[PDB]
């Protein structure tokens, strides 16, 4: 049994790994397909103890990842893509 305070801590307001599409961070890359097409990023999520608050980033940081671009017909490329990680979260009024 997960004790209440853990249940609470787990859903309240935190920077949680979710899978994000590459094209949602690099929308000018339309023509092509990155590999992998989605990456793991830390994102602020939570129920905030109130349905009228939501969990937002209060401190962020950059990470760079190695990805591949398999091309239409040109040839494949290596690329290093920077994304923004959520480091700290807080509950704020919607």
């Amino acid at each position: 049994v997960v004790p209440f305070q853990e249940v609470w801590g787990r859903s309240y307001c935190r920077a949680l790994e979710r899978l994000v599409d590459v094209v949602s961070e690099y929308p000018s890359e339309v023509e092509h397909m990155f590999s992998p097409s989605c990456v793991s990023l830390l994102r602020c999520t939570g129920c905030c103890g109130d349905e009228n608050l939501h969990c937002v980033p209060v401190e962020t940081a950059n990470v760079t990842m190695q990805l591949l671009k398999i091309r239409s017909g040109d040839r494949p490329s290596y690329v290093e893509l920077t994304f923004s990680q959520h480091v700290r979260c807080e509950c704020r009024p919607l």
């Binding site: 305070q5 609470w8 801590g9 309240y12 103890g49």
Partner: protein, 92 residues
């Protein structure tokens, strides 16, 4: 034991509204006992003597409860080498 109400891991539910006074009813036994007010995950509400008044017979009284007071709060005190907590949940 310093707190009058015996502890549970499981918080006591307090109902509150933005604007109106909020009482964290963690009363105690002697005036000379130091009690920390914590709010999850990492805020400490420090008694200043005008918005956060620390009353040893009532608990902590908060005038103007903003959203920053909604969630899981804990009163802490250390007596005789042991740490004592009482939990509360605010629900608007």
């Amino acid at each position: 034991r310093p707190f009058v109400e015996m502890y549970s891991e499981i918080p006591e539910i307090i109902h509150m509204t933005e604007g109106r006074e909020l009482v964290i009813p963690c009363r105690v036994t002697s005036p000379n006992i130091t009690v920390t007010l914590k709010k999850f995950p990492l805020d400490t509400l420090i008694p200043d003597g005008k918005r956060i008044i620390w009353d040893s017979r009532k608990g902590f009284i908060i005038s103007n409860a903003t959203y920053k007071e909604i969630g899981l709060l804990t009163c802490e005190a250390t007596v005789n080498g042991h740490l004592y907590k009482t939990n509360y949940l605010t629900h608007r």
